[PDB]
Amino acid sequence: GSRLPKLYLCEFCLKYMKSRTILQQHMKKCGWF
Ligand SMILES: [Zn+2]
């Protein structure tokens, strides 16, 4: 295929996080609204 690894995309600013745990932490930062 394209050999593109699907990472953990943020749904607020749309960035690819490496870990789900880190994404959860990020979701707090991006959820400060
Ligand atoms: Zn974000």
UniProtKB/Swiss-Prot annotation:
- UniProt zinc finger (C2HC MYST-type) residues: 7-32
| PTM entry text | Autoacetylated.
Signal peptide positions are: none
Cellular compartment(s) = Nucleus; Nucleus, Nucleolus; Nucleus, Nucleoplasm; Nucleus, PML body
Write out the similarity annotation: Belongs to the MYST (SAS/MOZ) family.
Tell me which disease this protein is linked to. Answer: Chromosomal aberrations involving KAT6A may be a cause of acute myeloid leukemias. Translocation t(8;16)(p11;p13) with CREBBP. Translocation t(8;22)(p11;q13) with EP300. KAT6A-CREBBP may induce leukemia by inhibiting RUNX1-mediated transcription. Inversion inv(8)(p11;q13) generates the KAT6A-NCOA2 oncogene, which consists of the N-terminal part of KAT6A and the C-terminal part of NCOA2/TIF2. KAT6A-NCOA2 binds to CREBBP and disrupts its function in transcription activation. A chromosomal aberration involving KAT6A is a cause of therapy-related myelodysplastic syndrome. Translocation t(2;8)(p23;p11.2) with ASXL2 generates a KAT6A-ASXL2 fusion protein.
What is the name of this protein?
Histone acetyltransferase KAT6A
Q: Which residues cross the membrane?
A: none
Native species: Homo sapiens
Q: What does this protein do?
A: Histone acetyltransferase that acetylates lysine residues in histone H3 and histone H4 (in vitro). Component of the MOZ/MORF complex which has a histone H3 acetyltransferase activity. May act as a transcriptional coactivator for RUNX1 and RUNX2. Acetylates p53/TP53 at 'Lys-120' and 'Lys-382' and controls its transcriptional activity via association with PML.
Explain what the record says happens when changing K15A: Reduced affinity for DNA
State the oligomer form and interacting partners: Component of the MOZ/MORF complex composed at least of ING5, KAT6A, KAT6B, MEAF6 and one of BRPF1, BRD1/BRPF2 and BRPF3. Interacts with RUNX1; phosphorylation of RUNX1 enhances the interaction. Interacts with RUNX2. Interacts with p53/TP53. Interacts with PML (isoform PML-4) and this interaction positively regulates its acetylation activity towards p53/TP53.
Q: What is known of its domains?
A: The N-terminus is involved in transcriptional activation while the C-terminus is involved in transcriptional repression.
